[PDB]
Structure formats: C-alpha cells, structure tokens
Amino acid sequence: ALTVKSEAALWKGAEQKVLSGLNNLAKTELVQITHHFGVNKQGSEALWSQLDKAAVGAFPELSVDETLQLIDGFGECPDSYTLSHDLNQRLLVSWEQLGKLNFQKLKETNPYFASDIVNQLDAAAAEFIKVRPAAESEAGGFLNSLGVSSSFNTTKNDIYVVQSASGKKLNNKEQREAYVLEKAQKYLKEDPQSKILDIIAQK
Amino acid sequence: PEDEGIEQQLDQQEVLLSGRYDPKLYDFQEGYTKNPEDDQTSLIEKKAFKFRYRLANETSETFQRRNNRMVERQIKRFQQPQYKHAFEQLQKNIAISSNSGNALHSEYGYLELLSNESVQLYKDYYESDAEEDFKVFENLSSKEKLVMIANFENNLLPKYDRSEVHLIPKRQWEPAFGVWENFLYDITEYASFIAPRGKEIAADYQIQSAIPLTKEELIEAGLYK
Amino acid sequence: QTNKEWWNLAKNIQDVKCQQELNRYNDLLSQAYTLSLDNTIRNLVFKAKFYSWLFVINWFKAFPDDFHPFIPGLEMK
Amino acid sequence: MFLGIFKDVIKLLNKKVVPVYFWFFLYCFLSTMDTNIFVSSCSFLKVEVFGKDENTTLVLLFYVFYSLFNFYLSRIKNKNNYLVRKHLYTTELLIELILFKYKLIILKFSSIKYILNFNVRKFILFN
Amino acid sequence: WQDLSKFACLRASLNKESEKAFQELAKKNNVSPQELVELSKIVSMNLDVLKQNINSEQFLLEKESTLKRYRQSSIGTRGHLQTVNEAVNTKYPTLAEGLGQVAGYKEAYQALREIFVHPSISVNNLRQGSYGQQFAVDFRTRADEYVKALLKDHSVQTIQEIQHTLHQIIKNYEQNPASIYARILTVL
Amino acid sequence: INFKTKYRFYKFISTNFNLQTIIKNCNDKIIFSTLLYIVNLNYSFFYKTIKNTDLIVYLLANKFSILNDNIIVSKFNISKFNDYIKYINNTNSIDTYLEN
Amino acid sequence: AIRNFVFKISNQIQNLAAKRSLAYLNQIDSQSVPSRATINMKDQVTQMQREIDNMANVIRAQIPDEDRAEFEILKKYYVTGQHDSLVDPQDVLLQLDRIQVLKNLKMIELNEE
C-alpha cells in the first residue's frame, strides 16, 4: 500500500490528500521504517532537506531518537518549515558524528587518507593557505602541565607535484583560473553575500 | 672587431685545418704503458674523440657540407615543441636556480635533451659513414652518457662573445650624514639593490649563454636560410 | 656461470640499465658467495686459512670496485 | 618601553614555554637537601627514598604501582578520544620504534659491508 | 614617481591625438618618443624643486628615497640625477613647459592638481601622520568623484587601470604622505 | 547552524563538484560530512577571517580545477636532502611536456 | 677608489657564484665539466633511490605472506609516512596490532588445539 503511495508522490496532486491521511495514520501507528520512507517521499515533494535527512537516517538504521515521526505529524503538508529544535539538533549532530566516524574508520584502514586529502586540497590553494599553522595537541599528562609540549609546526615551504592517476592531461593555469572563476560565480549565485572572490584574488 | 668567441672559433678551425692534427698521421697509444699498447679507451670515448676533432680529419669543403647538414638537422629538431617547452622552463626557473647549485627539475630535462642532442649530432655528422654501429648509442651507461655530453654544441647560440658591460647606478655619499649613517646606508643599498642587480645580471649572462635563438631571429640576422 | 643465490637477488633488482648502477649493488650480489660450510675444527681452521688467503690474494689482484670479473653483472642478468 | 621589556621578560618565563618542572629542577639543584623545602622536613624522603644506597624494594613497589596506574589510564584513553593529536615526544618515540623495526628487517637480509657502503655513499651525497 | 608617471600616461591615453602631439614635441626637441619619455621622467625628478615642496626635517630622507627610486629606474645610469636634471634644463630649456602643452598630459596634470592639491593642506605640517590620513580620505573622495566624471564619458580597461593607479597613489600617501605630496608638487 | 543551510551547502557541493573522486565507494552525504570535518580540523585557522563555506568552496574549486578525475599529489620541501632527491627522482620533465 | 675596488671584488664574487650555481646550463666550459657534475649527481641520487627500492624488493621476495604484509606497511611508512606530519604512527601501529592479533590467534591455535 505505502509503496503505491510512493507512486502517488510521483503522480499528480489528487492523491496528496489521501497521502496526507496515510501519513497521519502512519504517525498515529508510530511506524519505524515505513515512516522514514514516507517522510523521504513527502519531503522530496516539497524541499529536500528533511527527505534526505530521513533517507540518511534510514541508511544508518537509526532506531533510537525517533523524533522524526513527531516531525512527520506536523500539519504543514506532513512536514514543517523551521523544523523542531529537537530534530534540527539531532540531524546536525547525527550528520557530524557520521562524518567523524567515517573519517576515523578510513584513517584506521588507511593512515594516509587524511594526508592525501589535505595534500590534494593544498596543491592548488593560494600560498597563504599553505602557510597555515599546524594543529596542536590537546592531550594531557606530564606535558602541558609540568613539562613543555613543543608544537608540530614546520617550515611549510613545499613543492606540490600533481600527477594524474589515470594518465589524463591536466588543466593549464588559464584553464584552472577559468574553472575557479566559473565555480566562484556559481557560488555567488547561491550565496549573494560572500567574499569567495577575495580568496580568488589570492589574499 | 676581434670578437672573442668568433675569433676563438676561427682559431680552432685554423688549428684543426692546418693538417698537423690529421688522425692518420698519428698512432694513438697509451704512453704510460712500458710496452707500446694501442689506445684502450672505451668505444664511446673513441667515438666522442673522433667527433670532437671531426674537422681535423676532413678538408674544408667536406667539413662544411657535413657540419651544415648536422646544424640544419639540429635546428629542425630544436623547432620541435618539446625543446621549446624545455627552453621556456629553463627561462622560467632562473631566479630560483640562481639561489642554489642544486639543479631543479626544469634543468634535468634540459640535460637529458643535451645528451640526446649529442647522440643525434654524432649520428647526423657521420650519417654517410658506413663503418660504424649507431646501435651502440641505443643503451648508454652513465659514464658513456657523460662522455657523449661533453661534445654537445648548441649551434643556435649567438656565436659572438657574450661578455658585456652593465651600469649599476652608484649612491653618492651624503655630506650631511655621519660615517656610521653613510656606512649603514651603503650596506643597505649594496644588499637590497646591488645584490639583486648583480645576481640577476650574472644569471642573465649565464642563461643567454645557455638559451638558443629562435629560427626567425636567425633569419632576421641572415645567419640561416 | 651464476648460481641460484645470485639469480634470486638478480630478479628483484629492477629499473637497472647500466653496469655502473649495478656496480653499486656489489656487496648485495656478493651474498651469492655464501660458501656454506660447517664450524667443525677442520672447517674452522680451513675457513680461517681460506679467508686469509682470499684477503691476501685480493691484495695482489688489486681490482677496483668498477672492474669485478668474479661478481656477475648485467651480462648474466 | 621599560614596562614592555619587563612584560616580555615575564612572558618569556611562562609555564607553557619554560617548564614549571624545569623551575622545580633548578630549585632542587641549587638548594641543599637540608635547605630544600620539599625534602628537608620529610625524613622518609631523606632517609628511606633518597637516603639508601640500595633501595630495590621501594623502587620495585613504586614502579609496579606506577605501571599499573599508567596502564589503566592508557587503556581508558585508548578506549576513548579516538580523534586527538598526541604529544610530539610520544609520537616521535613511536616513529623511532617503527623505523627501528623496519631497520631490523633490513639488517636481517643485508650484509654489514653493504650497509656500510650504502650509508657512506648516502653521507657523501648529503655532503 | 612611477605611479604618477603611469597615471599621467594612462589618462593621456584617453585623450585623442595625444600620441600625435607627443611625437610633434619629440620632433621639436629632436628626440625619439622613448627618449622624450625618459627626458620627461628626468624632468619630474627635480631635487631642488623637491626641496621647496617638503619640510626640511624630512628632506634628506626623502632625497635619499627619490635618489634610490632614480637608481632603480631605467634612467639611473645617465649620471648624478641633479646634474643630469640640470643637463636637461640646459639642453631642452622649454621642454618642461612643452611637457605641459600636450593636451592629454595637460588634462592629466590639471586633474591631478584638482584631486590632490588643496589649499587646506599645510606642507610644513605634512610631517605628521593624522594630517596625511585625513587628507588621504579627502583624496579618496576626490578620486571617486573624478572616476565618476570619467565614467560619464568614454562609454574600460584604461579606466580600471587609472582607478588602480589612483588607489596605489592613495595607499602610498597613506604610508608616506609628506614624500608623496612633495613628489606630486614637484611634478606639477 | 541551520540544517536547511547545511543541506543547501551540501546540495551545492554535490551538484557542482564530484565528491566521488575524493573518497572511493562512499555516499555523498557521508563524504561531505567527512570533508567538512577534515577542513575544520586542518583549516580552522582561517575561520577567524574567512567563512567555512567560502574556504571549502575555494579548496574544492582549486582541486577540481586541477582535474575533474582522481589525482596524485606529492609534497616536497626541496631544501631538505631527502625531499630534494625524491623531488627529482619522482618527476620527469617529459610528463610536464605531456601535461601529465 | 675604495668604492670601485670593493665593487670590482663584488663583481668577481657574483660572477663566480653564478658560475657555481648555473654553469650546468651553458656550455662555456669546453667539455661541459660543470654540467656533467650535475648530471652525475642526479644519476647518483636516482640510483640511491632505486637501490632503496631494490633492497625492499629483495626483502619482499625473501619473506612469507604475513611478514610480507607487515614489511609492506613498514616500508611504506619508512618511505613516506615518517616524513608526513598528518600520518599517524598510532594508526600504523594499529594495523600492525591487527596483524599481530591474527598471528597470536594462530599461535594459540598451534599451542592448544
């Protein structure tokens, strides 16, 4: 039945009222996974943030913190603008924790993962970025309490040799500048108040 | 004008064309041996020695023909995009190269091209020769490559003497300052101006002695047809 | 005229084109001279005599590290 | 200014650049055991701990208790704080251990004369 | 001096027949256009005039800075700048005046005087910094007004370069207002 | 601070840039969160004067201006002996001529 | 006179420094002696890198599979990881400890099966 309701999401708006009634019934019944799928469908009909959050939660199979169903009970078309303060914090913290756990897993499997990503991001970055100070240690013990902990900073006067993994031809300086300008303009379309172009000006 | 480089080339041609140094007149040997023994240097060394004194074994007309063929082939090879890119990189990484005796990547490719050019010059000059095996130039040792590189000749270089004069403006001592103030001014001026100026002038001399002339320039000078 | 010990080390020495470079892998390839022998009284005395003779006769051979007839190089490989 | 110089002198001896443990070591170094506040009063420190030529039992007891406590703390820290940078000294000790393991593996299959030749050539190239 | 010369050249580029007038002046002075550019650059650096447009307390430092600028310029090899300048005043006595008679350069110098030279500015009091900062704010306002006036007519790259040169001159005056204003007064 | 803004930024990043090159065989949202964590861990020094969104956009724009597919980047401080010998051994100008 | 003398010494020093730092670019020397020196230095350092790699290859070919995985991890760390600030020896030791966990499991199986 609910799967057919998914087609109603892709169909015309005549079944939306029936879809709203089905969503209300599901909220009353307190569905676990079908509620997530219906939330994804409804929040893909209007906006995308709540839908993708519900889909990501279903992918991690988040059984606990089932406040999304409470969000699914909101009368503003089975959703709500300016989402509940409980769900918003829950969604943000869940996203951040998933990212941190994935980073930890990848770093444990491949110790060079973070180093490779940082080097790739710093390869074409402006020189001032590459002179950023190194991260310090926040650990405790004899050091930082009785002794002294020396920093991890280095000279950071480095040369980046960028080689394509597949052997394809790399973009020249003019092509890289054109791509950078294109993306900066596209982001200016997204963000009217941003100083990204200033970074494009190389500090 | 007794231009230094041109007159040195003419002196070399005069010495080698006098007929006193024709290889047929000499039986090259290892003098240090207590028993008379032939020249036992490597085959690549012998070929490099023969190419170094190719003018001594040939008359003026044959030398001119062979050398003109070799130089025309070298020019047509230098017109290739790879050589142009190598020389562009050489002109690009000039200031940094002035700061250290360690060669960068922009110059090691140039040196590899120099080795290839030496091999190709030997192949071009002695093309019509039929008593040698150019296959010996296919895989060369490090020592053999160094031996062949010693005979490299960038014939697209300006053959005239590159020694020249430049004027670095001089700071006159100010009578209104003391000895110590004038000395500090002179030290600061020396470093901040003369050191970049002098280093850049000397590096420019080196690179101009290194970088060749584009073919059009030669035509504009009437040195190529 | 090599042995199994030298060949096992020879395959793993890659990206070598000139004998000069292979000249820097001289003692590494000299491990093909294992000369496996016991440490009995006769062998230990024989080992001492043989190694002393090899040391003194390498003095009279007096070859540099570039010319090594007895250490196989790029030809065998 | 003079005030600025005094402030700089004060800051250059801050606990994060000049160790308070270094200051304690200086005080212990410059002060006689009878004029040292931390040890003159406690005869147990002046006779039983630092007053015995052979104190193997006390050394062993202190070491065992310290080892147990630090093992417990290390296990707790390894079971948490998965994303935090350690101290430079500890990381360098770990780096030295790993490099030593790799060098042992190299030394297992490499002859002494070959190792010497390679290291001498590397040093000449460095010069 | 380089910023002032570039600004004058850029705003004389907009005026038409400016190249023709410059070539006529070069022919009248029996020099090539490049030689005339170098002669104008020499004429701009007139230390005695620079002495009359800056406080003596900072003259020697400004004199050394201008001499260093001359020594770093392409014209620094001719000789001792002062004497060299005198040479021009003995070889091309009217050229300086002629350098103001060109249409484009005349417009450039008049507008440079309008933007920067004001009676409110006390040269002897330019040794301090707050004077320079407030007058630099005034210069920025005048430069914005003149950029708007330029954008009214001539309807791009030249205008952008002119505005960049104005910004550089404003920044230089922010750093060393006494020296920058002395240079502007000397040129005018 | 708003999940709607975070998802807007994520959608922009996924639409303009191909994050699949950064991490192989992973979901776009997870890759986005991991990249945000990495940038905040390594580039937090510029958050005082540069917004995190702007910095991430700049870094991704530069990296994908280098090439749209996977790349390999090696870092050398040629002032050091070990870096310099690896600097010239690992590169060959022929590749530069081929723009590889 | 003193200034001219000092500047002449400066000219000699700067010309000699440019010779010492750039003579491998031009063929002013008849036999390209400075150029051959730089080419030889490049050859020596490249052969040193290849020698490290070939020693690694020999050791890799002379070890079993478990020690081969351990040696691969250790060699990669020695070549690149130790010189990178963002690589964690804790993570390297964690990989080594997982390998050691498998080895200890096999050891217990051999001991008490």
Ligand code: HEM
């Ligand atoms: C036998 C009995 C005693 C025992 C077991 C004892 C034990 C200790 C211990 C373990 C410490 C700390 C040392 C360290 O961890 O590094 C200490 C410090 C000290 N003790 Fe005792 N002590 C004893 C008797 C005394 C007495 C009688 C006095 C007074 C005269 C005294 C005064 C001190 C002082 C002043 C310190 C330094 C602590 C500080 O300054 O913060 N102790 N003692």
